[PDB]
Amino acid sequence: VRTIRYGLIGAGHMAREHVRNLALIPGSLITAVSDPQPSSLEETVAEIGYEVTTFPDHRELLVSGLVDALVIASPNDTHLDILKDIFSNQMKLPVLVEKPVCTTAAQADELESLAAGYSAPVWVAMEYRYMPPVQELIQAAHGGKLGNVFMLSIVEHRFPFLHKVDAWNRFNERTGGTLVEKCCHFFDLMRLILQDEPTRIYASGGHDVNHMDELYEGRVSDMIDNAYVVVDFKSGRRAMLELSMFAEGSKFQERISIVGDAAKIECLIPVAASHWIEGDESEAVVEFSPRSPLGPETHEVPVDEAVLAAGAHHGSTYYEHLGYRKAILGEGPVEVTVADGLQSVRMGLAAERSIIEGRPVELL
Amino acid sequence: VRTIRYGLIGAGHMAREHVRNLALIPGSLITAVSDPQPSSLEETVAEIGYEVTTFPDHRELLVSGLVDALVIASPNDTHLDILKDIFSNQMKLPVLVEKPVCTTAAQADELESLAAGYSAPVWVAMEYRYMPPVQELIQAAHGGKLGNVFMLSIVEHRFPFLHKVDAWNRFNERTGGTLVEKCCHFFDLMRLILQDEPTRIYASGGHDVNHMDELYEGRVSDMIDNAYVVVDFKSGRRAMLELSMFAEGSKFQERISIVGDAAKIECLIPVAASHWIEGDESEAVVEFSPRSPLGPETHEVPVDEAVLAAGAHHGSTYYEHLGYRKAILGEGPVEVTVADGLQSVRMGLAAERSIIEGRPVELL
Ligand SMILES: NC(=O)c1ccc[n+]([C@@H]2O[C@H](COP(=O)([O-])OP(=O)(O)OC[C@H]3O[C@@H](n4cnc5c(N)ncnc54)[C@H](O)[C@@H]3O)[C@@H](O)[C@H]2O)c1
Ligand SMILES: NC(=O)c1ccc[n+]([C@@H]2O[C@H](COP(=O)([O-])OP(=O)(O)OC[C@H]3O[C@@H](n4cnc5c(N)ncnc54)[C@H](O)[C@@H]3O)[C@@H](O)[C@H]2O)c1
């Protein structure tokens, strides 16, 4: 072993996944949980399965001395404030902070300065990359099987935003926008696969279908439910994101395609069985499509049954935690830094502005 | 029966497909072929299989008195000139004119005026819609199985521009640009499926891979080989086109998806036999993906063996000619008018400007 005491700031749905995944990793002990909602604590405690000290407020937790490391899985607009507390705390602990790291540019601007002066690891929890199918595509791109890389397409086709606590995931004011909230993953993936930095974004999107029967003090959701985004990079590579939140019918929730000048590669990621028909479970597919001699190659990508049953992310949360652990113990780097978190968000924020004011947006 | 005498102005590769398809349609007689290149004439005649009168120049053909209707399958920048001759000819005849109808805005502007004062049918040969797979998508969109329609995605993944006669298809000056030349069909498809008009268009693209090694008086092809295009419509529907001319590896050359608020529908078009592996004759698929009860429905869509062997367009050219026949006999409408042809071109021209400038462009 070699034990790490973990504290959870925020004890909702994703917290419980972090729990189930920490359960598979020896050396991992949860010792403190913070949540302003007792019903959330009761359920999260039940899931953990052992005795832990609870707090309604994270400040009491920070100075409790029960924890070697933190996990933040509270609503998006809370994230910066909690971090500012962690940064100004005497103790100075590692943090895994759920995405989005930020929800506005004011925050991004502020966070950027503070994080520079902090001495403990900060990892932004964008796990998508450790999905085994996506891992293949990343190594295939990086290692040269595609030749020189130019195009990258991501298509997400999925169900409407789920029902959460105090319905915080309904308004842009609280989420950063659909493209920040659900899409910072894909904007980071772009940077990772293309090995490049964005120069420009343009998007078209609407709120066309969803959440039209929900009032919250008389108001309907102001958020996007579909969009097309186009990103240009400093070397002239280009990428595109397509989103529909009313395409749950799709066997495959994500489709990721990368074209280079020697070959093309695509992956098809199924819907989580927890969201699909029971029995009609599908396995993920990767297709390698070379130009040079015509002859595409398809193959299923399997994971571990336990790791996959640990969450709704095809085992990725597990690996994410293996990474975080290593970094705490100085046996690996932070793979997903604040910087990364901030680019992913500024990318979404830019995209949101573009839909609003019918112009592209420059990135710095 | 009722026999129709057809004249072909231009006798290259597509002309021979027009021939092969006219061969399947009873009542179709070719009587005159025009081409400045006798190599082209002798092969096109060989294909026809019977005796016909040839001309080097289309003007002699127009006043030959052998023809009830015309087909234009010459290089793009010739198209307006030939039409001006047809429009001013004493005997005013029906015309099927290959796409692009135009190559510049000056021409679009001019053609628009002239074609209004011409009294014979003018049909722009964008046959894509009659591909049986695509037909299902259009009826499904129009007829309501998708609910209200919002998104349309087109992915073309194909080979570099081919070697043509006197190599006319290499410079923007002669083609109108890649987005005009090879993409006007998809811009028309958008208008057709969405049943709407574009308000705005934006694209990112480059010349990144292809034709770095053909010189024409010392100069390299100045044409795009990949792009992402985004179109917004007057009702808030949107569409996006992805093009790579270096993705010949792809089993499926086209992928079309349409998302509405009850269901999604996709079609996959294989590479034409003549361009694919020998033996690997894959068929097109259509997948219906409802939201309401999860349960996707897939099925292969066949074309007739002869109709499929008659062309490189999944049988579409045949149906196109069934329509053109009716219009010649004044028993049927022009399904694809000059107006349609002109929007398709202006859409590409707009997209070309957008890549160049860096801003979206307004459409009227
Ligand atoms: N990594 C991923 O794949 C992924 C997936 C979904 C959600 N998330 C992120 O997880 C976070 C929310 O988790 P969820 O989706 O389970 O939502 P949830 O509503 O189920 O959980 C949020 C919890 O935070 C509590 N809370 C509210 N305000 C708080 C505060 N100021 N401090 C601490 N806790 C507070 C709520 O009472 C609730 O118990 C968001 O940042 C969201 O973006 C990440
Ligand atoms: N699916 C489609 O709709 C499709 C497919 C292929 C080509 N096309 C169109 O067909 C045209 C090109 O035909 P192709 O691809 O078979 O090319 P090609 O180069 O193989 O044949 C073109 C022929 O036109 C002749 N020609 C040149 N100048 C002429 C003139 N002034 N008058 C008459 N004939 C002339 C050439 O000598 C040659 O014989 C273009 O407009 C192209 O966009 C359409």
Residue numbers in the entry:
A (entry chain A), B (entry chain B): 9 to 372
Authors' text:
Here, we identify an alternative approach to sulfoquinovoside hydrolysis that is adopted by these organisms and discover a family of SQases belonging to a new glycoside hydrolase family (GH188).
Two other orthologues, ArSqgA from Arthrobacter sp. U41 and CrSqgA from Cryobacterium sp. TMT2–4, also cleaved α-PNPSQ. To gain insight into the molecular basis of catalysis, we determined the 3D structures of FlSqgA and ArSqgA using X-ray crystallography. The active site was also largely unchanged with the notable exception of the Tyr136 residue in some of the individual protomer chains, which rotated 72° about the Cα–Cβ bond to engage with C2–OH of SQ in the ArSqgA·NAD+·SQ complex.
